[PDB]
Symmetry: C3
């Protein structure tokens, strides 16, 4: 029955907001939740009410899907995501991503907060992801394949769509907002990484490290939903500075990064309208 | 009851083909399924009918065990394997390998199709595996130990038997068929690897990358079944060429590689008869 | 109900030994089990009788908790641990560690036997751990967070307490016992590592490799229990010598290492009394 959930999600969403045809899906991580306040003609749906969507174990911290118009683009925005560290496995974002796909989104704009493995890319920066290295155990597609959504095996050669990256690089350049491209390393968490793990990630070629992104990106590649993913850098990774990592610390720099992050998103959306 | 399955498999196989005493076990991966057509005095058993053997989730694509004589050697050939990405865990090949052991095979000849991490080892090549690096989560032997089959802890120093490798290297040299030796890196799949993951695998010392081999090889080391393993290279690994990876692409070069792969297997078997 | 087990463990332990107020917790791995013989005013409790404590699958090899006075310090010593390879997941040491915490221990002294990734650190040596790289799948804290014990996210910057390391380095220097500091790499097991895996671990910056430590250390960091961890080197890691790895081989050098290991522990305890 897990496999049917996106079809039920679609029927539910279509009944709540008849007529609505989203063009772009968003996943809103730390610092970017507030972007939903800018959506007009909006409808908000609790994840508790949408089949297959993640429900947090923390009382009062369940996410919401916001549907509406943003900068001339019809969007469906997940305010909140599920993570591998929640204990529901790597497939925790597969049904939501398939729901974006079936709703007709042309692509997914994934956002998250994370640490920089490069000392010269500082807290408060935004980075555009160009590839990943997965260190979470397994992948979301382990298990029987649902061929309704995609093939048993699939290439990750364009997992972070090349043309969307070129589109956004042009926007950043127009805005004079620095936007490096980096390789994302996933980590299971929910502890932050040790300093030795961070040095390992540098050795194997990582630029950014975090606890999300990979599950939803792999689920998207499987069902052929294009992805662009940008990250708010909230700290240099463990061992690279003397800052104490904590969710409070994360949220501090996520707020900072959100100022330019929002300018990039708005200009990008206006360019797609 | 999972632990008893090989004893039931043996009783079943012995009833279907009384008298048969296999000398060598094979696991036949992509391109090498057709080798079963060369077996004489053959009996074929659907995996569905053998306790503990893997049954695919894909309608009509269940494997078969073929018992008979090949080039003067009594063999038992698994046409098809189970993989970690099927979602039954790392132990999906443990009962079949224990079945080879209890049936009396002197060793296991493992075959698979995979990508080359070395640009100079080209698609259509055959490589002999000499060691592995496991990146799948856990190992097949996680869980209580079945001491009927092997010890709680076990060395992997000769996981790809040294003397069998020397035997096969002599065969390849006699035949003038190039046969490099390589370190195999396992990957969970069922996505292919990203280009950054491939560079990571090069950095850590890999030569070949694929989605099988390790589970059955670790299960074999535990129960003391010797292993020789050869791989058909079906592509350079992701990012090392501009080919699009897909199962169709795999099968294309598996057919090519199978020509020399079969010559090596036949000469090797004649040398053991 | 898993989450309540440490509270039940505490009530049970307090009833069996009313009044007892441990200052330091120990986990006793290979070669160091015998240290419990030196505890006075001792009480011994089978793990079978303590809620949440690990019970081995091997008949007759269940561990025991020993409570008493050692070198002027009230201690609670786990003689035996649970491991990831037992198949109960990464959380197999979480309840025992939380039990140490609730009992009031000021820190945990973790001990284990393991392989050296450095050829110049020889079998029979003792190493003090300063950091780790986890290669086991996931972490003990994957799943809903029990905020009674610690936060959803947590830093590993001081996972091997810096001041305890300085304390012990002074002891080793006073005793003229060599004590290098090393990065520990965890491995799922229960196979030992391949030679290629060992070279990978050297490449990524490891100094010592073993099948425990990480689960209990991460559980301790989550609930804020300070850790000092020392390792008995029982072999150079696979491929670095011609010794055959086996539990028998491990136990051989664990006995050797235990002589200086015990001197270090005794002097360290006297310094804390
Ligand atoms: O895994 C992570 N590592 C970090 O450094 C970080 N910062 C924010 N979020 C993060 N996640
Ligand atoms: O994991 C894999 N990587 C590849 O490049 C490949 N080619 C065939 N089969 C393969 N499996
Ligand atoms: O994973 C391990 N690797 C080893 O070399 C070793 N020696 C003792 N115990 C060990 N565990
Ligand atoms: Cl985030
Ligand atoms: Cl194959
Ligand atoms: Cl130990």
């Amino acid at each position: 029955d897990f496999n049917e959930l996106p079809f039920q999600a679609v029927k539910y969403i279509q009944k709540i907001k008849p007529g609505f045809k989203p063009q772009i899906a968003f996943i809103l991580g730390s610092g970017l939740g507030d972007l939903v306040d800018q959506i007009t003609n909006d409808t908000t749906i609790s994840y508790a009410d949408i089949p297959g969507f993640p429900v947090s174990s923390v009382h009062g911290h369940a996410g919401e899907l916001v549907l509406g118009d943003l900068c001339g683009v019809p969007v469906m925005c997940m305010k909140g995501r599920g993570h591998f560290y929640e204990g529901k496995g790597m497939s925790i974002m597969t049904n939501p991503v398939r729901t974006f796909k079936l709703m007709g989104c042309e692509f997914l704009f994934c956002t998250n907060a994370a640490g920089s493995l490069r000392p010269e890319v500082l807290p408060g920066s935004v980075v555009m992801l160009k590839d990943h290295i997965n260190t979470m155990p397994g992948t979301p597609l382990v298990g029987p394949n649902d061929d309704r959504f995609g093939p048993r095996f699939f290439s990750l050669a364009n997992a972070y769509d090349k043309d969307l990256r070129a589109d956004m690089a042009k926007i950043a350049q127009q805005l004079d907002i620095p936007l490096t491209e980096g390789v994302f390393v996933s980590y299971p968490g929910p502890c932050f990484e040790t300093p030795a793990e961070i040095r390992m990630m540098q050795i194997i070629g990582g630029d950014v490290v975090g606890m999300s992104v990979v599950p939803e990106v792999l689920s998207a590649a499987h069902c052929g939903l294009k992805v662009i993913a940008l990250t708010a850098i909230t700290n240099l990774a463990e061992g690279l500075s003397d800052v104490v990592l904590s969710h409070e610390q994360t949220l501090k720099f996520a707020k900072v990064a959100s100022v330019n992050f929002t300018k990039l998103i708005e200009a990008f959306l206006k360019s797609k309208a």
